[model samples]
Target: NTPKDQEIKKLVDQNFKPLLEKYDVPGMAVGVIQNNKKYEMYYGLQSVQDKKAVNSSTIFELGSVSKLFTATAGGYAKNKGKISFDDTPGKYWKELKNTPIDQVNLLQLATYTSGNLALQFPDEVKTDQQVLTFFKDWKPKNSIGEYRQYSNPSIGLFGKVVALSMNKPFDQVLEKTIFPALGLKHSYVNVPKTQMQNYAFGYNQENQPIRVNRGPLDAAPAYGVKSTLPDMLSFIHANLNPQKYPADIQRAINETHQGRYQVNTMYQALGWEEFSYPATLQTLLDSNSEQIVMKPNKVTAISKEPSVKMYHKTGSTNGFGTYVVFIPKENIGLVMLTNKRIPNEERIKAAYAVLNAIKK
Candidate 1:
């Protein structure tokens, strides 16, 4: 490793260890990929009760990170003429008899701009049959492309459409089609029985450790993914280098990353959030300064000053936190996943430190 590598290792170790100690986090894995090289580090134990040490192989629930894959799968189906981004849910799933969801296109659902309710059904919505029941009975708050409100049900419905188009179950579609093509071995919509031993137990705010089971919405495709550091990096690589994938698959991935709808100042591109950072704060030592520019700029233009164009996505769940960011001008990309529910401020600060540390 070079001096830069050593410095990053030191900084990550020095900072993250204290957080683990303070929060009683059993384990965490952080992965970074820059200039086509990858580095992954594991900290703490997989379980404080069993005293199993954390490793790169441990699978953590990706939560909304699953949205990226759902969008990618949608893109794949679109490229192969299986479906169109502009097609509505009712176009494929005829069972949605009551709702105007038939007018909601796949693209809108994937980008979360479909104007659906924030949560289509309650947390008690457990099975696909139940999801169908809920959608069949409910109505949308806005028409298609009217607004952007994050919802698991909308994306989950979209995922169901993709699976139906492919003539396979949702997990099989993810496992057989998307994962292998992306070179992702540890990513899965439904975790296998054999991999159970490698899963991590998540802790609550009080640090009470408990086994976090995959939720009923796990098959919804909007969320419900279990993955490791390497798998996520492979996903990022596919996003950055579509040519390395099959020609048709490459096209679909490209389409997913393309800008679709504008929400406030940020445009929704399939499943990712798009924004640009101010050049003034490009080299700032503070991460809070960077966040202020990124979040507010997403809703409105801060100023007309020159800025670096960028796109990013963030995911969080009961036990995991993940973020993926790319700066187009710098040709730099980053992915971070932690088993512990670190505060947004802390995670942003840590990520900014790594970004600033490696900037040219």
Candidate 2:
């Protein structure tokens, strides 16, 4: 390892290891990109029962990280002149024309600003008819763009609309169009039987191991993808270096990262969140003189302070936790993936530690 790598490892060991031990995490993979060079490290074991070690190549469920791909696909279609963001869902799917959801537009769904209430559906909603039936009777509690309510159903419906416009099923469209263009061989909705051996099993709160089974609504564009670190890194690199991708496709990704709306303190891009963190303040106390003093200094210790902007996204599922962050101002990117669902605050703190260590 290089000097920087050793420094990062020390910080990770000092801050992350103790937290993982406290939470009983079985395994994790951390990938960092700085100065256009990548550094990857693995810790713990893949399976507690088998005692297999984790490596950089270990595959993990991406969970909602898949949303980025879905949004990218939508952008590609729009750039190709296949569809427009302003087009209503009912416009493409005529079946939705007379339905209650006729007014919902593609932009609303893509950004998750839609008022569609049900974020997910029960196991019974198998086919297109079922999806339509569920939405036709459903009503939007808030007007579109009034507030940001993350809705899987709304985004999933947008995927269906894309499929309808392309005259292909969602999975087929994803496989034939998006995956091949990006050179993503391992990322997919359903894990192939041949590749099942490589898939990681998720553990529950009780530490019971379980593999995800296929469902009727298996191709959840909003949050369903299984991928490896290398594959995801390739996807990230494509975004970073668009010249390697087709001209139109590259333009589409650029648009996705562009700011669309502001939700609370965070800014929402197509499928990612952009925000800034301010510097930390310190206070001093003097008991001897019966006086108290406060001091504030520009904390340049962190990579992304309030003045520095960052683009990030977090994904979580039954047995997985994933985080991706990029400091555009600093030109640094980091990805963290774990087989166990570490508490959110712990993950954020650990990630910040890594970032701060790198900046120093």
Candidate 3:
């Protein structure tokens, strides 16, 4: 290994080894992009029962991190003149016409500021028709753009609307359109048969292998992307250096990072969240706390767009845990993926430590 690679290894071992051991993680892949150079490290088993090892190509479910893709798709569609953030779901789905949700508009749904949508759809909402009914019968607590309620249904519907506007299924739009445009080959909402060997089995809290369950909105756009470290590193690098990608991809990725609303200390973008540069770990933890995730926080629209200092998102399925953070000005990006679901705070802390050490 080069001296820099050796240094990176030491940093990873010092920060993440204990994190993996502390959480009893089955497997993990950590990737870093520094000065546009990529460094990747894999640890533990892909499957404890099968004794499979995780490698560079091992696919881990991205969980909610998939929202970034969904948001990018929306931006792409908007750029293509296929859809507008000002447009409402009523424009695409007739069932939502005259509904409270239809009045929420695409921008609100994309930013999770649509009145007060719950984290997940109600238990009674199961089928497609039921989802429509849930939207139709829904009532807004704070009106549109008043508060941010981080939820799958909010972005899940936004993704669905993006697909509808593009005249393709959500998976098709991502796997066929978005992934190709971004030059991501190993990323998918649905992993193909040939890639099954590379897909890790996510272990739940019960120590049982599991994957994301099919939920009421198909959930593909919200928590369904499975990807490898190299692919994710490409994505992080793409966001950091969009000039390397095509114009549409560059614009779309940039669109996701644009700050829209300020909820407490965190600035909400379409899919990602932003904090100022040289940010403290406390700022990240406070913004990403359960209190923020579980409650509806009032949002104040940015009078002028904030600079993209740090962009991050935490993701998890029932089993998988993932986090991505990048600092554009510093030319640094970090992606952490694990088979076992761990707390967001732990992921944030570990990434913050590794990032802090990188400066030294």
TM-scores of all models?
Answer: 0.86, 0.85, 0.96
Query: 64-156 in candidate 1: lDDT tens per residue?
Result: 777888888888898899998777787778886447677677776776665655643587777867777777766666655666666677788
- Candidate 2 regions exceeding 4 Å error are 122-127, 214-219, 276-308
Tens-digit per-residue lDDT, 33-120, candidate 2: 7766777778877677787777755778876777777777888888888889889888887767876677778887776666555546
Model 3 bad stretches (over 4 Å): 303-305
lDDT of 2: 0.69
What's model 1's lDDT at 247? Answer: 86
If candidate 1 were superposed on the true structure by all CA atoms, what would the RMSD be? Answer: 4.2
What 10-residue stretch in candidate 3 is worst by lDDT? 211-220
Ranking by lDDT: 3, 1, 2
Model 1 gets an lDDT of 0.69
Model 3, position 316: C-alpha lDDT score: 90
What are the lDDT figures for the candidates, one per model? 0.69, 0.69, 0.87
Please write out the lDDT profile of model 3 over residues 107-171, one tens digit for every residue.
99998888878898777788988888777888888878888888888898899999999999999
Return whichever of 2 and 3 wins on TM-score.
Answer: 3
On lDDT, the leading prediction is 3
